[PDB]
Design a protein around this ligand. Structure first.
Ligand code: CL
Ligand code: CL
Length: 162
């Protein structure tokens, strides 16, 4: 298992524009198009992203393409982030995936605010961090997914995904 599969599991795959759990126009594998309410804006964002007139519909290939860019962007965001970088560096490979998952889902920014959890994570206090991660909007809004991520951090394994 790896970050791609991991995220592919948490995000699913949709070839037509859709609304996410927050109600944002999204497409492919969790690729947010826009936070605005215009489907036109979403269609425009989409066309601009794909480089063609999509008509709100993309092929699996295109989707996977977006996905790759997004994963990559995320990694780089982490690596460029000063609060995140050293965090990431301290972790083992699985746990890194967990961090990436969080970043893909909620942005560097979002993630950077779990400062207390990060800190526990940094200290390798898994149970404690898990508990602390749970006290968040994130957990309350997308509990199942969050439990998966959180278990990953707690355990250092892919158990929640098998
Ligand atoms: Cl893009
Ligand atoms: Cl969920």
């Amino acid at each position: 298992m790896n970050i791609f599969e991991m995220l592919r599991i948490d995000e699913g795959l949709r070839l037509k524009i859709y609304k996410d759990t927050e109600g944002y126009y999204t497409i492919g594998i969790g690729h947010l198009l826009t936070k605005s309410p215009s489907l036109n804006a979403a269609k425009s964002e989409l066309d601009k992203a794909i480089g063609r007139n999509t008509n709100g519909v993309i092929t699996k290939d295109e989707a996977e393409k977006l996905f790759n860019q997004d994963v990559d962007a995320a990694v780089r965001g982490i690596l460029r982030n000063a609060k995140l970088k050293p965090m990431y560096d301290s972790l083992d490979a699985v746990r890194r995936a967990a961090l990436i998952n969080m970043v893909f889902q909620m942005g560097e920014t979002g993630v950077a605010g779990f400062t207390n959890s990060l800190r526990m994570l940094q200290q390798k206090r898994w149970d404690e961090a898990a508990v602390n991660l749970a006290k968040s909007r994130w957990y309350n809004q997308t509990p199942n997914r969050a439990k998966r991520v959180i278990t990953t951090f707690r355990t250092g394994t892919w158990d929640a995904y098998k």
